[PDB]
Amino acid sequence: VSMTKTSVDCTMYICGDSTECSNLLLQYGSFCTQLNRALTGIAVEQDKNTQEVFAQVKQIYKTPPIKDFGGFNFSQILPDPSKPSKRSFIEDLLFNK
């Protein structure tokens, strides 16, 4: 769904705290500025992709205290409230593998 949001200082990557290098880079135009707008625009899409996927509902629901579902055991899919991270046993396997 998402990628790792990244940004790169087009000046510090090229000119590592060098006044002479920076003075020459200033004559190349907005090549430096363009690259920050592209990577910044990418980082926004990785934040939208989670809203267009998980946030299909504005309203939050919860399970009842008595988990009577006609004989179906959802304990492996539902979150563990006794754990520090409110995730399920299957979610643990995915964040570890």
């Binding site: 790169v8 880079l25 592209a38 399970t63 055991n73 899919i77 396997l93 995915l94 964040f95 593998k97």
Partner: protein
């Protein structure tokens, strides 16, 4: 994700169409069985078998994911593809690009002004090309991930908030319901099929 489960498990397909209406789970599947051209007598007459089959099938997912390392290959490539771009972006700094040396201090503190500016002009032109190569790569990879998210956004709507009559979309076979699960930079659907 915990909300969509509590809605699907207990309200079914109604919370994705306005306010949530309560429907018991054993009565949910009866509609879903009717949603695929199967009379709902087979469910109420065999509730014990449907539960033991489902609960046994959920157990195989834990053993399969906990044993098969190649199961999450799709999400690891997204991380590996990005890290290769980062290390490649850093390794290019050590390259000379046809200059005396990749270090500015070895040129600025060694050669005179009118000579050092030429050597510095190559590293600037070389390092700047490495960025446009990186940015253009991530700008294409952001398109593939964007289509994979728009796809998963549809499956979180058609397969989870309802019942899909589309074949092989919400899993192989006649679809009944789905149960999503989170993951690092991705999702994992647990499609149920008849």
């Amino acid at each position: 994700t915990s909300a969509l489960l509590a809605g699907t498990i207990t309200s079914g397909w109604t919370f994705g169409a306005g306010a949530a209406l309560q429907i018991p789970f054993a009565m949910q599947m009866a509609y879903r069985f009717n949603g695929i051209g199967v009379t709902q007598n087979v469910l109420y007459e065999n509730q014990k078998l449907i539960a033991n089959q489902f609960n046994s099938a959920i157990g195989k997912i834990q053993d399969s994911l906990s044993s098969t390392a190649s199961a999450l290959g799709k999400l690891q490539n997204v991380v590996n593809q990005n890290a290769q771009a980062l290390n490649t972006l850093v390794k290019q700094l050590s390259s000379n690009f046809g200059a005396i040396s990749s270090v500015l201090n070895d040129i600025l503190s060694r050669l005179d002004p009118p000579e050092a500016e030429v050597q510095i002009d190559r590293l600037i032109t070389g390092r700047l090309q490495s960025l446009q190569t990186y940015v253009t790569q991530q700008l294409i990879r952001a398109a593939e991930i964007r289509a994979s998210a728009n796809l998963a956004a549809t499956k979180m709507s058609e397969c989870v908030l309802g019942q899909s009559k589309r074949v092989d979309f919400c899993g192989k076979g006649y679809h009944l319901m789905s149960f999503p699960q989170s993951a690092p930079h991705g999702v994992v659907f647990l499609h149920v099929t008849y």
